[PDB]
Design a protein around this nucleic acid. Structure first.
Ligand SMILES: [K+]
Ligand SMILES: [K+]
Ligand SMILES: [K+]
Ligand SMILES: [K+]
Ligand SMILES: [K+]
Ligand SMILES: [K+]
Ligand SMILES: [K+]
Ligand SMILES: [K+]
Ligand SMILES: [K+]
Ligand SMILES: [K+]
Ligand SMILES: [K+]
Ligand SMILES: [K+]
Ligand SMILES: [Mg+2]
Ligand SMILES: [Mg+2]
Ligand SMILES: [Mg+2]
Ligand SMILES: [Mg+2]
Ligand SMILES: [Mg+2]
Ligand SMILES: [Mg+2]
Lengths: 173, 123, 270, 128, 195, 184
RNA sequence: ACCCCCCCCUCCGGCCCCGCCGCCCGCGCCCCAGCCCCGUGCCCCCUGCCCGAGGCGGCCCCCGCCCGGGAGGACCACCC
RNA sequence: GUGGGCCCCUCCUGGUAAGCAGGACGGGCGAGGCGGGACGAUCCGGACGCCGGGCCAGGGUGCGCCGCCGGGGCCGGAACGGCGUCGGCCG
């Protein structure tokens, strides 16, 4: 559901400063209306330009090619009930937006932090040798094999319409 | 049943009226059709003639299937005459063939007060 | 508030309700436990209470203050004329308890047993065991019917009755009771022993022995409707209580707003 | 004592999702929750699924490390692996489940009366 | 309108109760066999204290008015199902009267054809590290007197059914030999097109 | 990791048969059976060696493979050599008495701290108990199953308890002194 | 482990066996494993829609008082 | 006619505090049906002639009891303790 957007903005031009500077950002958001709001949240803190005093020049939407599985490293900050913290996370996904979906669900589940509690500092691709987290690194290898981690899930699902049967089914492994 | 005697059919059940926890709409019946588990596979049984046997007269009551209900294969049906509570848990027949019962399968509000702007002729 | 001084409740709540007994006589509800291999023996008998006396006996104890001295003891006397065994019943242990297989009666049944089947004997028309005696005449039917108890039962009992024409009682009909056969080597040996007792008398010297211990089961003396002082043993109220001192004063607190089953009330005693 | 493993080139049957009912092959392993699958001779686009949807067959296809939808397509067709699955008793049942999914209400009526002829024949046989 | 006969071995108590209750209200007759082999998730001792805390609740002024606490495994299952039924109405009392519960498999059900509900069986429902106990063992700790009798009867029954299977095996090799009745080979091939 | 695993060496003198997490071992001394079917394990018997493995360990499942491998090693020493526990009867002023009975399947104890109660402790089957014929006031427990030998020695220790006294001063009892293998 | 649960012990709807002596109803049996799951990932899916023996499981029915004594008792009941 | 009011949200004063007592903008009950919050004059929605059809707010969707699936994680109450488990930051 996440999407990559590039936003340009600038302070409204005046007599003291004709041709103000242009600032660009990369944003991940579910749509164009949330993305432009998040651009004004940062430009107000980092550059002290409220939304009343500036204008947005573009909301570029960028669609990425998948088809191969890469590593990503996300540097972010979030807020808990006792303060603010920094954190680095690693994930394997096919596009950057999909890697941000995975991050937001792990923050929501293990830290209970929602979307507006989180500021993304950095998102970059990480080559296989340079990985630093054990979970990701296991799969950055040649020849990884494991048996199915939950084959019971197949059997139960079929038993939701086939409510009564004549023998208890097996779980092939 | 001397006119539906030889008609093969698909089994069904009358589970209850349409309701909430506060109110109950007796003019629509909820019906369970065997082999229908999805809202999508309710199209096949949509709009077809059904029947239930009132086991005080022994005669059938005829009706039709109108809408689906929920996500899980339930349907809504309207009968010629609204059903009594005694009939819950009983079996419903979904006929595979066609039967011309005239207008004896249609609800009582649609037969009269159905508003055809129509008149009383007086012969 | 808390009851200020400590004192137990009056009477035993495990003998409730205090109603009249509805069983006719004392009924033996349990039997002694069977021991696989033990010598065969009978476990019960039925008598009538005759009287009390006292005896002098020489005490042979050890560590007691009566170690080599004489004591006077009270004894009770029970009248036990011989009983007649008339039938054999078997039961099986099932997931629903004890269920019976069949009951095999004797070929010939006496007058004291036949009278227990009728309300008035002189007036009634006599049709008890009329067909059974005809079929069972030839003894083969008994052997076949005993051919089941050997194959399906875990517990064997004999049916026996008393002879009330050998007592000073008024009744003329017998009292009928099952007596369990314990001991033996297997089930099949306890049915050969029960058959060898059919239509025969049994003396009490062939059940109990001298110095052994027994249990006595009966129905107590009756006193009719009786109040709380005597029925339950509660304390009698002081002399200047307005409406009488043979009562329980408080029969419950305000809450709960009912009378509890643990409170003493008047009714049938004995 | 496992005989079916999650690995590159393992053939799977899709049991849920919008591609339910189809075969496909694994090309990459994101984690213990998800894979990259791509079956191009059966009608599946290269996508990420959850391992909760994939049923492991007993067949592995020999493939390269990072193939492409064209190279995989000719790698698959070289192997006889797909044709042996369809001959097994699982593959035969899948075939019948595709002729009993198109049925219409008139046809439900016809199948139902046939089941009444089979039930009564097998009883007119069991009585010797 | 046949009877649905369910072998309760391996099933979760509450997940099986929910199924039976919904079937009863659809006008179905249901029997349940081997109630002492059903399963309750949790450690046996946690399950034990839970059933001993129910037994402490009785009407203070007269225990004959109070909740009755049944000790056999079949009756525990039947009281769980009544919690999922509007049993104080006529529609609800008709549903209870259509239900039967049995410890073991007794002769009145011994030739019925059985079924299972795998969506409520513990090997598909519970994680491997969760503790679990059998209903029969809980009952024996709160007062059921017949644990040993059900086992003796179950043992004799399976031996007699194990002999039966051997002769049933041979019968199938004669019943199924009947590929010589063409008037059925005309039935199978038409069913072939639609399958 | 995806798998946690340990491996052990199978000695030349035993036979091993593993099937559905039932390990049966047999050499000269005897034959042993254990049942590890209460844990999720992937055991592999192949090429005269044994491996135990757990797929996707999360918490205390990583604690399993070394436990099941250690129990199997005690199942090779017992079937080869056997276990031997030596206890010592200790006392002050009241000699404990000890008679082996039941042809070395039970022991009686008398006169512990001058007491009238007598003590009877039966051996778990497969265990034998003899008085020392070398050094006085000492018992010998022998068997192939290490759990069985240790459970019997602890049941003897638990039978001789001094009640209601300062145990730091009253120290009579029967104490395990040597936990080792046999020596033939 | 004075605790808790069961036995013993008190009451006990219902039920069973035995004495004297007919009705009705239904048609369906492998077992055991889930980190061997032994080759699975099905069958059933028509209770009349055309089904309707024997065996095997169910169901119904079947039994007086008054009167007088008492070891029983307000009246009744209970035991004779 | 009324000149006994009370409650909610924000903001306050006395009091250890109170379902205590006294003030303020706006709203409600009073004098507001219906659904939901198990249950409640005031909370969440929505404010009302008599009907038929459609759409759906608030709250929810194992059975009682109308309605559910797919996916990613984890597995009343204070100071103060925890080599329970999963995840981080600094050396
Ligand atoms: K007081
Ligand atoms: K007092
Ligand atoms: K008193
Ligand atoms: K009271
Ligand atoms: K009372
Ligand atoms: K009292
Ligand atoms: K009184
Ligand atoms: K108690
Ligand atoms: K006692
Ligand atoms: K104050
Ligand atoms: K108002
Ligand atoms: K922690
Ligand atoms: Mg006075
Ligand atoms: Mg006065
Ligand atoms: Mg106030
Ligand atoms: Mg007013
Ligand atoms: Mg309400
Ligand atoms: Mg429902």
């Amino acid at each position: 559901m996440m999407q990559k957007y590039i936003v340009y903005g600038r302070r409204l031009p005046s007599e003291k400063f004709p041709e103000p500077e242009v600032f660009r950002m990369t944003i991940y958001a579910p749509n164009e209306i949330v993305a432009k709001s998040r651009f004004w949240y940062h430009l107000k803190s980092l550059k002290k330009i409220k939304r009343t005093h500036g204008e947005i020049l573009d909301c570029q939407h960028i669609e990425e090619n998948g088809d191969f599985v890469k590593n990503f490293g996300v540097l972010l900050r979030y807020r808990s009930r006792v303060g603010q913290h920094n954190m680095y996370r690693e994930v394997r996904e096919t596009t950057s937006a999909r890697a941000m979906d995975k991050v937001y669900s792990e923050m929501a589940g293990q830290c209970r932090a929602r979307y507006h509690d989180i500021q993304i500092i950095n998102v970059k691709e990480v080559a296989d040798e340079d990985v630093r987290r054990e979970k990701v690194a296991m799969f950055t290898q040649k020849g990884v094999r494991f048996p199915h981690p939950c084959p019971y899930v197949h059997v139960k699902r079929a038993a939701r319409t086939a409510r009564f049967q004549d023998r208890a089914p097996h779980v092939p492994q | 049943m001397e006119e539906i005697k030889g008609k093969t059919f698909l089994p069904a059940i009358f589970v209850g009226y349409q309701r909430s926890r506060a109110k109950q709409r007796e003019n629509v019946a909820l019906v369970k059709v065997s082999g229908i588990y999805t809202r999508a596979e309710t199209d096949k049984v949509l709009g077809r003639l059904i029947a239930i046997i009132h086991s005080k007269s022994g005669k059938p009551i005829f009706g039709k299937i109108c809408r689906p209900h929920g996500n899980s294969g339930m349907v809504r049906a309207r009968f010629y005459t609204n059903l009594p509570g005694q009939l819950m848990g009983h079996k419903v027949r979904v006929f595979y063939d066609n039967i011309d019962v005239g207008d004896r399968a249609t609800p009582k509000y649609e037969r009269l007060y159905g508003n055809p702007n129509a008149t009383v002729t007086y012969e | 508030s808390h009851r200020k001084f400590s004192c137990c409740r009056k009477g035993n709540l495990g003998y409730l309700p205090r109603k009249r007994c509805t069983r006719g006589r004392g009924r033996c509800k349990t039997f002694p436990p069977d021991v696989q291999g033990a010598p065969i023996h009978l476990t019960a008998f039925l008598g009538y209470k005759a009287g009390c006396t006292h005896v002098m006996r020489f005490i042979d104890h050890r560590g007691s203050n009566l170690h080599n001295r004489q004591a006077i003891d009270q004894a009770t006397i029970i009248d036990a004329p011989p009983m007649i065994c008339t039938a054999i019943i078997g039961y099986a242990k099932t997931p629903k308890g004890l269920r019976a297989v069949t009951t095999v009666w004797a070929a010939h049944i006496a007058e004291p047993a036949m009278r227990r089947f009728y309300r008035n004997y002189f007036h009634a028309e006599k049709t008890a065991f009329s067909t059974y005696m005809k079929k069972a005449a030839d003894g083969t039917y008994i052997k076949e019917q005993l051919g089941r108890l050997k194959q399906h039962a875990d517990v064997i009992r004999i049916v026996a009755h008393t002879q009330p024409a050998l007592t000073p009682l008024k009744q003329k009909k017998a009292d009928i009771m099952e007596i369990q056969v314990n001991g033996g080597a297997n089930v099949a040996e306890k049915v050969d022993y029960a058959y060898a007792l059919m239509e025969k008398p049994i003396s009490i010297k062939d059940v109990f022995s001298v110095g052994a211990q027994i249990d006595t089961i009966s129905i107590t003396r009756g006193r009719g409707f009786e109040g709380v002082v005597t029925r339950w043993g509660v304390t009698r109220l002081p002399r200047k209580t307005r409406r009488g001192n043979r009562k329980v004063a408080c029969i419950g607190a305000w809450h709960p707003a009912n009378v509890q089953y643990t409170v003493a009330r008047a009714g049938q005693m004995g | 004592s496992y005989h079916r493993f999650v690995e590159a080139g393992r053939l799977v049957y899709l049991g849920d999702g919008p591609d339910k009912g189809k075969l496909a092959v694994i090309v990459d392993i994101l984690s213990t929750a998800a894979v990259l699958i791509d079956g191009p001779t059966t009608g599946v686009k290269r996508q990420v699924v959850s391992l909760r949807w994939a049923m492991l067959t007993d067949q592995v296809i020999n493939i390269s490390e990072k193939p492409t939808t064209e190279q995989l397509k000719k790698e698959i067709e070289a192997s006889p692996a797909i044709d042996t699955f369809m001959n097994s008793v699982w593959g035969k049942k899948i075939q019948q489940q595709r002729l009993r999914a198109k049925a219409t209400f008139e046809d439900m009526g016809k199948i139902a009366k046939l089941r009444r002829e089979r039930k009564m024949a097998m009883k007119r046989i069991a009585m010797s | 309108m046949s009877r649905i006969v369910i072998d309760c071995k391996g099933h979760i108590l509450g997940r099986l109760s929910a199924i039976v209750a919904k079937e009863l209200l659809h006008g179905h007759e249901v029997a349940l066999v081997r109630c002492e082999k059903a399963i309750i998730s949790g450690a046996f001792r946690d399950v034990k204290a839970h059933y001993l805390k129910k037994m402490h609740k009785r009407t203070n002024f007269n225990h004959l008015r109070g909740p009755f606490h049944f000790r056999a495994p079949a009756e525990i299952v039947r009281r769980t199902i009544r919690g999922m039924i509007p049993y104080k109405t006529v529609r609800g009392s008709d549903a209870m009267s259509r239900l039967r519960v049995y410890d073991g498999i007794p002769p009145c059900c011994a030739r019925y054809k059985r079924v299972v509900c795998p969506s409520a069986m513990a090997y598909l429902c519970l994680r491997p590290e969760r503790r679990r106990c059998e209903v029969g063992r809980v009952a024996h700790e709160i007062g059921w007197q017949h644990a040993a009798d059900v086992e003796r009867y179950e043992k004799r029954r399976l031996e007699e059914c194990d002999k039966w299977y051997q002769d049933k095996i041979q019968i199938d090799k004669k019943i199924a030999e009947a590929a010589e009745k063409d008037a059925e080979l005309q039935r199978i091939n038409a069913e072939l097109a639609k399958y | 990791p995806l798998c946690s695993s340990m491996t052990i060496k199978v000695p030349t003198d035993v036979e091993c048969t593993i099937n559905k997490r039932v390990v049966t071992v047999k050499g000269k001394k005897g034959t042993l059976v254990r049942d590890f079917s209460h844990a999720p394990l992937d055991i592999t018997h192949a090429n005269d060696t044994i491996s135990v493995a757990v797929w996707f360990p999360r918490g205390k499942r990583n604690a399993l493979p070394r436990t099941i491998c250690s129990h199997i090693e005690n199942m090779f020493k017992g079937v080869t050599y056997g276990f031997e526990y030596k206890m010592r009867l200790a006392y002050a002023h009241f000699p404990i008495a000890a008679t082996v009975v039941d042809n070395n399947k039970a022991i009686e104890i008398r006169n512990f701290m001058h007491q009238i109660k007598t003590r009877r402790i039966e051996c778990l089957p497969g265990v034998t108990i003899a008085m020392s014929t070398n050094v006085k006031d000492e018992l010998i427990l022998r068997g192939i199953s290490i759990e069985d030998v240790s459970h019997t020695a602890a049941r003897i220790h638990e039978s001789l308890k001094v009640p209601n006294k300062d145990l730091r001063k009253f120290l009579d009892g029967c104490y395990v002194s040597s936990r080792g293998l046999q020596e033939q």
